[PDB]
């Protein structure tokens, strides 16, 4: 039984359908390398002081996400390549044509997935993240463009976006409408406990226009409330796991941790 606090799952509190598709993850080599590299960056005193100074200077005028993109700081980690492959049930050599990463941030998670794809598309609202994504040579689409291109996507990733976008139910329905149907799969990560808002400039926020009814007193109860949400958009869970959503740190902490539920979805 895997008992690490970041990966452990109380299987008996999952509903019966979810028990059948849960996939155990663990703290593996790729995860530890991310943490090692994060600890090293937090030891760079002059770099951390610079990032802190610039973040304070521009905090009123820019969103926190755009400040991170401007500095190339605060990158995140959802899965290692091995964990990604295990969840998708694919070999290291596996390939398909087109990936779309919605709300891709600085692309440091996108690039874990990228070797399995010919073409990589991304969306982002932050101007400086778009710069990061374009430095990685991803094809950036507008947020109202990607679902109107006329072509479909083999894998759509939507990692830690549902709690941060204005219209998450429309988003899920838009994903469904341009996913390649015969083999297409969706990769979705959601921080639990679910606490949605739309980031604004200057630490401000706004409430989303659409509500997801996700309730529960713990990870497993909240996950049990997702199948109904996914099904309204025409998805059923093919596999899911619990993974720490890690982020690089600062002068006080070597890294930061949130609790991700990571799903592979198949169209009904």
């Amino acid at each position: 039984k895997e008992n690490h606090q970041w990966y452990v799952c109380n299987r008996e509190k999952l509903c019966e359908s979810l028990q059948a598709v849960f996939v155990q993850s663990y703290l593996d080599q790729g995860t530890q390398i991310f943490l090692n590299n994060s600890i090293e960056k937090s030891g760079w005193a002059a770099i951390q002081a610079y990032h802190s100074a610039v973040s304070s200077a521009f905090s009123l005028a820019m969103s926190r996400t755009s400040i991170n993109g401007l500095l190339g700081r605060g990158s995140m980690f959802v899965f290692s390549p091995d964990q990604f492959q295990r969840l998708l049930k694919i070999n290291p050599d596996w390939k398909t044509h087109r990936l779309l990463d919605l709300g891709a941030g600085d692309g440091e998670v996108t690039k874990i997935m990228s070797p399995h794809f010919e073409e990589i598309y991304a969306t982002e609202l932050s101007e400086t993240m778009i710069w990061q994504l374009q430095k990685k040579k991803y094809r950036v689409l507008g947020i109202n463009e990607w679902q109107n291109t006329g072509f479909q996507y083999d894998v759509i990733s939507c990692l830690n976006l549902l709690d941060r976008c204005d219209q998450p139910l429309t988003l899920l329905k838009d994903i469904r409408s341009v996913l390649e149907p015969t083999r297409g799969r969706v990769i979705l990560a959601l921080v639990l406990p679910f606490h949605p808002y739309v980031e604004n400039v200057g630490g401000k926020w706004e409430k989303p226009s659409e509500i997801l009814e996700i309730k529960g007193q713990n990870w497993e109860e909240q996950v049990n409330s997702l199948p109904e949400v996914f099904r309204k958009a025409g998805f059923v869970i093919e596999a899911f796991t619990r993974l720490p959503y890690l982020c690089e740190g600062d002068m006080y902490n070597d890294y930061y941790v949130l609790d991700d539920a990571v799903f592979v979805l198949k169209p009904v």
């Binding site: 990158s75 830690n160 606490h195 006080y252 930061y256």
Partner: peptide, 12 residues
Amino acid sequence: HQGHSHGHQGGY
């Protein structure tokens, strides 16, 4: 203090 890039998080 910069925190997690995805933002502050509440509880259950």
